[PDB]
């Protein structure tokens, strides 16, 4: 019955895209973006659950656009909904050209995170209070995503 | 109107899990796994389409368990189905303990890859011929997955 | 001629400390922290100037404590004071252990950054307006730091 | 003792060459190639011996050309010959341009791996039996390499 | 009361600047240079103290210029002056284009390094002896730097 | 006939062994060691020839023992002998435990480096003058290594 507002789990990350992070085209290597998402989704889940977490699954990722070298890479992740031991985490990724001002949504992800105790066994997590228009929409469309997730389980 | 067998597009990775590859929970970093998954999917798509490709969307990553330090990561990637520019890539990860002989299924993943020109625009792709029992099975329930994937996008 | 509030340049970074980030003593390798400091200072300055930046110099780094595996690294940069083409960037770093809720100030640093154009030559920067009392305090004690820093250069 | 075919020990790696993997010229860093080679040889020895392994010595690395950005690195590793507690691993590295369909032989390597116990001491290994013709010719002229290597060890 | 010549502590590092070491502006990413600096400072201090060390603070980092891809990066660190348990470490970083034979001073830095026992507690370090005229000059002007650093900490 | 002393080519490197460098066994990952040798060899060869160089071959690496975490890693490279366009490079690796005083030879390697011009074509390098006892020995035994090297190519 424990309840925290979404704002509590909110995690921001701001990176600078450098040549070691690039692919063979000129944009950021997709794999780096994923490593960032997984990291921020974990921090988000930890802030909310107050315990160690494991990524149960990633329920969706789509690359709309890609950050170029020199861009600022903005990452934002928050807990959108919960089960008893699980937490749906939403991570969105923006590219920001600080020189020209141009900013676009590049990536978007949904992850299921599970909180675990010292011995690695799943642990009850507090439920999440949505407050803003965006949050309240994502809270209500989560059971629809979980039912869709549970059917993605059949091949 | 071109068709190639699955065998053509198959790509195999075999990593050795080292301390830098690990995390605070003594096991492997899930972000490292995603990096290998994206990397091998890219190669798998490329070998099939003979061109540069981008990961359009990651559709599922199911973390069943994970490898410890000193294990061997075994990755298998192959194309399961094709549209006209898009193609489904399947990636399997195994943790293989070379001392004890114990083999474990680490994670399964489904991605959608799109071949592109040097202009960065969707490019016509060859088709895929399933052959083994596994290859046939994944191919048959490929339309059902693409329909399920469509539906997730409408919240 | 141009002015902007501190709030505009503020940059937040949150990291998870993992084994490859650690050193031979079970703490976070100090060399990683400095790298994180430099990247966020560069972002901070870029956000305020809307141009490419170069780190002119680091004026001090102060290692008070340091993060452990599993901790969260919390980094905050913002612009504290400006010159004609230069900007003082203050970066502070916090270790946050989310399991027990313990939070500790790890590092503090003052850098000076210069905005640059196509040719890498100095570019006029907008000034900065402090808002909070910590921000105003830093803006006020900033000319003293530039003086101290000037005097430090001669001492060789 | 036990005897296993070469196929059992065969290990394949395939990688995508990226800018961080490259050197100050157009191509891949030679040190990245070596790290992959040591890793694959280590994996090849383990799958065969079913124990931990150390790299006793590198006997040769022949750099013929090297992969450029966007190439796939095809790496092939297998056991060629066996001693008491030693194993000869041969590593084949290919650059494969998936666009053009151009495939070149990058490098070849011969390594000696030693199986070790919990306390890092030489451990008896199973023997290897060749099945393909190239596997046969590598097996035939194995002692001739070890004889050259022994002679090499004392030319100082 | 113990005493060692600067010469003993001196640590040399030569690196090759590769594309992963670079930034969005063509030269070496400053955050990499700082990591190298911290590392060689630790190695310098470790040689003089014969114990584990921590970077207490950084006095200054002066970026004069920066290296390009393909350059040799030359680092030199030594201990310039000591306290009860602390050591001032000076590091200078030279860019060197071997092809053209052009050597340029890239960075300078002063750090305070504290020697520590097995439980992390600061422990006494031996004193240092300046020998060359440059080493003597740095030794003579060291107290003044600590004074400037002390007054720097007060400027908040 | 152009000629420089061995000392001119000499390159020293001192790294500190951190956990990202370690392997699944407590000691330094051999791969990293190889990467360090290759680097110092290239620097050494560039310094002697005043041009870009390629690592033609590695003629031997001898692993005697390993550096452990927290050790100082000491690498030293110098040109032992020269052909027309090539340079034999000797790389010795020491692990130095700075707390205990223990220093041990962990590795030795011999590399053949080739100097190249702007467009990758080989280029004549100056001959090397040995001076120290160690230097003079390795110079006189280098043709013996050259004969053994070229023979290993036939098998």
TrEMBL record, chains C, D, E:
GO molecular function (one): long-chain fatty acyl-CoA hydrolase activity
Key words of the record: Hydrolase
Domain of life (superkingdom): Bacteria
Name of a matching Pfam family: 4HBT
GO cellular component, one term: cytosol
Claim: Transit peptide is one of the keywords in the record: no
Family matches, as InterPro entries: Cytosol_ACT, HOTDOG_ACOT, HotDog_dom_sf, Thioestr_dom
Annotated segments matching region Disordered: 117-156
Biased composition (Basic and acidic residues): 133-146
Residues annotated for CoA binding in this entry: 55, 57, 62, 64-65, 84-86, 146
Signal peptide extent: none
Location of the HotDog ACOT-type domain: 7-119
CDD domains in the record: BFIT_BACH
Compositionally biased tracts (Basic residues): 147-156
An example Gene Ontology biological process: acyl-CoA metabolic process
Similarity comment: family membership: Belongs to the acyl coenzyme A hydrolase family.
Protein's name according to its UniProt entry: Acyl-CoA hydrolase
Species for this entry: Halalkalibacterium halodurans (strain ATCC BAA-125 / DSM 18197 / FERM 7344 / JCM 9153 / C-125) (Bacillus halodurans)
């Amino acid at each position: 019955i424990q309840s925290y507002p979404v704002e509590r789990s909110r995690t921001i990350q701001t990176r600078l895209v450098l040549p070691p992070d690039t692919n063979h085209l000129g944009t950021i290597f997709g794999g780096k973006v994923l490593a960032y998402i997984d990291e921020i989704a974990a921090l988000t889940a930890m802030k909310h659950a107050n315990s160690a977490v494991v990524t149960a699954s990633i329920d969706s990722v789509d690359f709309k656009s890609s950050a170029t070298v020199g861009d600022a890479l903005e990452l934002e992740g928050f807990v959108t909904h919960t089960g008893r031991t699980s937490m749906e985490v939403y991570v969105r990724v923006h590219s920001n050209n600080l020189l020209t001002g141009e900013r676009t949504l590049t990536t978007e992800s949904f992850l299921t995170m599970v909180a675990v105790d010292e011995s690695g066994k799943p642990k009850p997590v507090p439920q999440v209070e949505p407050q803003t228009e965006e949050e309240k929409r994502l809270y209500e469309t989560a059971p629809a995503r979980k039912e869709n997730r549970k059917k993605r389980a059949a091949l």
